[PDB]
C-alpha cells in the first residue's frame, strides 16, 4: 500500500525507510507492494494539520505513525494529527506519547499507543503494597485530567480487597503555597504518600514539605515517573521509590515494532470480502470509511508475540499492556535500580533499600497517636455543665462519704441564644459519663480532650 508516517528528523526518516525495506525483504507483497512516505514537524498548529492532511491523504495512505518531538509540550503533534486522521477514521499509531487524555476513546475516535500511559503505572503502586505489609495511604493528587484519572483508577482497583484510601487531598495546578494541605496531612496516622503531579508542582510540594519535618524517619514515600526528572530531582528528599521505563526514548526499536505490527495487520486484512480504497485529496470527499472500524478491530487483536521490545499485546481501549518497569531508588542523589517489574509480580534485587531517614529496616505504615478527642453534650443527669470562675478550676465539692467529685476542663460554646456566635469559653463538665470516661481512660492507658458540640442536637 502507501503507508506514511510523521517523524522528527531526517535520520529517523532514513531509519524508517531502512525498516520498511527490511520488512518488505522479509515478505514481499503480490502486486501492490509497500511504499513509505515521511514528513517533518513544522510547528504552527494549523499549518501542521493542513500539511499532514494534504501530503498524506493526497497519497491514499492506510495508517499513519506519529512520534513525539523532544519539545517539553506533552501535546504537540498528536492533537492536530489525530483529529484530521479521525475524520476519515483511518487508524494512527503513537510512539512516545504517554499522556492519559488520549486513552478516552470518545474524543479521539482512532488512536493506538505503543507505550502504556501514565495512569496505568498506578497499578504498580498496588503491587508495591502487596508484598510489603502496607494498607494505609494518604495519596495526594493534582487537579488536571491525569490526576483525576489516576485517582479514579486506583480507587476502582482498590475495591477488590475491600479496603479504602484515607485522604484524597488535591491542590490547584500552578499554585505557590501548599502548606495547608501538608499541615492537614501531618495530623494523621498513616505514613505512606503516593504524591503524583507535574514537575514544577512536585518541586513546590517538596520544598513546602521539607520545612515541615515530613521527610524524617518512618515516612516512606512513593513517587511516579514524572516527579523525578530534570528539575524535581534537585529538591526531592532522600529515599523516594520512583519508577521508570525500560524502552523509553528509543525510537529505533519502537519504529521496528510498529512497522512489524502494521505489516502483519495489513497482510491479514488484504484477504477479505469487502475492501474499499482510501479517499483521494485533502478536500472533496466527506464520507467516512466503510472499512475503518474493521481495520481497527483487526489491528487491536494482534498477538504479534515476536519482536525486539518483547511481546506486544494490546487491550480493550487501545493501549499497550505487559510492560517492564524498573523500580529505582535514590541514594545520595544517585539513582540506582533496586528491583524489577515483569507483570503482576516484583523481583527484589541484590541491593539493600535505604529508606528516608537512613535506617535500614521496614518502617511501619501506622501510628497509634493515642489522643482520642471526644465529643459530648449536656443532657441533664448524665453530663452536668457549670460555668468556671477566674481561677483555672471549677469548684471543690464533696458527697455523703466526703469523696470529692471528678471534673475536667470542658471546651464548649456559649451561644444558646440564636444569632450570637460561639464564645468557646472553657466551662466545666462532670457527671456519670465523665466518671465512666475517667475509669475507661485509666484502664486502657490513653488520654482525652473532651469538648462539646456546636449545634447541640442529638444527630
Amino acid at each position, epitope marked *: 500500500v502507501n503507508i506514511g508516517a510523521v517523524l522528527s528528523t531526517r535520520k529517523h526518516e532514513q531509519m524508517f525507510r531502512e525498516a520498511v525495506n527490511q520488512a518488505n525483504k522479509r515478505h514481499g507483497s503480490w502486486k501492490i507492494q509497500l511504499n513509505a512516505t515521511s514528513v517533518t514537524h513544522k510547528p504552527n498548529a494549523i499549518q501542521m494539520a493542513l500539511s499532514v492532511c494534504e501530503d498524506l491523504i493526497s497519497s491514499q495512505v492506510y495508517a499513519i505513525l506519529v512520534s513525539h518531538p523532544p519539545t517539553p509540550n506533552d501535546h504537540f503533534t498528536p492533537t492536530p494529527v489525530s483529529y484530521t486522521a479521525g475524520f476519515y477514521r483511518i487508524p494512527v499509531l503513537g510512539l512516545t506519547t504517554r499522556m492519559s487524555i488520549y486513552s478516552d476513546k470518545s474524543i479521539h475516535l482512532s488512536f493506538l499507543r505503543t507505550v502504556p500511559p501514565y495512569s496505568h503505572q498506578s497499578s504498580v503502586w498496588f503491587e508495591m503494597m502487596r508484598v510489603y505489609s502496607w494498607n494505609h495511604i494518604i495519596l495526594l493528587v493534582s487537579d488536571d485530567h491525569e490526576g483525576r484519572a489516576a485517582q479514579k483508577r486506583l480507587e476502582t482497583l482498590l475495591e477488590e480487597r475491600e479496603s479504602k484510601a484515607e485522604k484524597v487531598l488535591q491542590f490547584d495546578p500552578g499554585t505557590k503555597n501548599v502548606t495547608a494541605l501538608l499541615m492537614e496531612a501531618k495530623e494523621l496516622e498513616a505514613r505512606v504518600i503516593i504524591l503524583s503531579a507535574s514537575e514544577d508542582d512536585a518541586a513546590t510540594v517538596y520544598r513546602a514539605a521539607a520545612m515541615l519535618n515530613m521527610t524524617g524517619s518512618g515516612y516512606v514515600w512513593l513517587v511516579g515517573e514524572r516527579e523525578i526528572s530534570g528539575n524535581a530531582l*534537585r529538591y526531592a528528599p532522600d529515599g523516594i521509590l520512583g519508577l521508570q521505563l525500560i524502552n523509553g526514548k528509543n525510537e529505533s526499536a519502537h519504529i521496528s515494532d510498529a512497522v512489524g505490527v502494521v505489516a502483519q495487520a495489513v497482510h491479514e486484512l488484504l484477504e477479505k470480502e469487502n475492501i474499499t480504497d482510501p479517499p483521494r485529496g485533502c478536500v472533496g470527499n466527506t464520507n467516512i470509511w466503510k472499512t475503518g472500524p474493521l481495520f481497527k478491530r483487526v489491528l487491536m487483536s494482534s498477538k504479534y508475540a515476536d519482536g525486539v521490545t518483547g511481546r506486544v499485546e494490546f487491550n480493550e481501549d487501545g493501549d499497550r499492556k505487559f510492560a517492564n518497569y524498573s523500580i529505582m531508588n535514590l541514594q545520595n542523589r544517585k539513582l540506582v535500580q533496586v528491583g524489577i517489574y515483569n507483570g503482576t509480580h516484583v523481583i527484589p534485587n541484590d541491593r539493600k533499600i535505604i529508606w528516608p531517614g537512613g535506617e535500614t529496616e521496614k518502617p511501619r505504615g501506622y501510628q497509634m497517636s493515642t489522643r482520642l478527642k471526644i465529643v459530648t453534650i449536656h443532657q441533664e443527669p448524665f453530663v452536668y455543665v457549670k460555668p468556671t470562675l477566674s481561677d483555672g478550676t471549677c469548684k471543690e465539692e464533696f458527697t455523703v462519704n466526703g469523696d470529692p467529685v471528678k471534673k475536667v476542663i470542658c471546651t464548649g460554646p456559649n451561644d444558646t441564644s440564636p444569632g450570637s456566635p460561639r464564645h468557646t469559653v472553657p466551662q466545666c463538665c462532670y457527671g456519670f459519663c465523665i466518671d465512666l470516661l475517667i475509669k475507661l481512660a485509666r484502664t486502657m492507658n490513653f488520654t482525652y480532650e473532651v469538648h462539646l458540640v456546636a449545634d447541640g442536637k442529638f444527630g
Partner: antibody
Amino acid sequence: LQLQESGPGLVKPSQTLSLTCTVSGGSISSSNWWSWVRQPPGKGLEWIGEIYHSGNTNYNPSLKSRVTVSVDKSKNQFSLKLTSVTAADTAVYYCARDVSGGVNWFDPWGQGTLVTV
Amino acid sequence: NFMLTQPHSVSESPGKTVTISCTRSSGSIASNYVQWYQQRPGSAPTTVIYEDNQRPSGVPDRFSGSIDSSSNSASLTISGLKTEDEADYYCQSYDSSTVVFGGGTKLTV
C-alpha cells in the same frame, strides 16, 4: 572527626594496594558516607567511590570493575581492594568525609599519602 | 558526564576585582548547584563556598557566588584582592550519575 590514612608508602607495581583510613572523634554509626577522591599531580580531580556505613557502595562507572571498597565498625575503618594497578595510578590518594543532608558536600578532608608508582 | 572549564589561571594587581567562572558543557546549572573549594599549596583542600548562598562560619564575606542561568556559567566575586588569599580554586558539581571537579585555577597577587 579527624581522618588518617594508614598505608605509608606501599608502591609495589602489578599488585593489589589497599590504603586504610581511620576516624578519630567520630563514630561511623551515623547517616553519612565516605569518599576517596583521588588527586593526580599537576591536573584536576577524579572521584572514585563511596560506601555507606552499613551495606552498599557507589563507584564511578568508568573504573567500575576494578575497585572494591569495604568498611568495618569493629576496628572502625574502611579500605579499598584496588586491583590491576597500572602506570597511570601515580596519584596521591585522599580520604574525605561528606555530609548526606540534601547536598553532596565533602567535610574536612584527610592528610593524604604519597603512594606513587 | 560533562566537564567544567577554568582555563588555566588568573592574575591581577592588589585591590582589583576579578574572578574565574565555571562553565558547564552539557545540560544547565539550575538543578544541581555547584560548590567552590579552596586548596592552599602543600595542604589538603578546604571548602570556601557551597550553594553560592551559604557561607562557612569564620570565612570573610569577600567571596560571594552567583548563578547566571543564561549560558551555564556560575560566577564568583572575590573583590578586595590582597596577598594572603593566594591559593588554588576548584569548582565541583554532580548529576544523576557521578560527581565531577573542575580543571584548576591559581590567582596571583
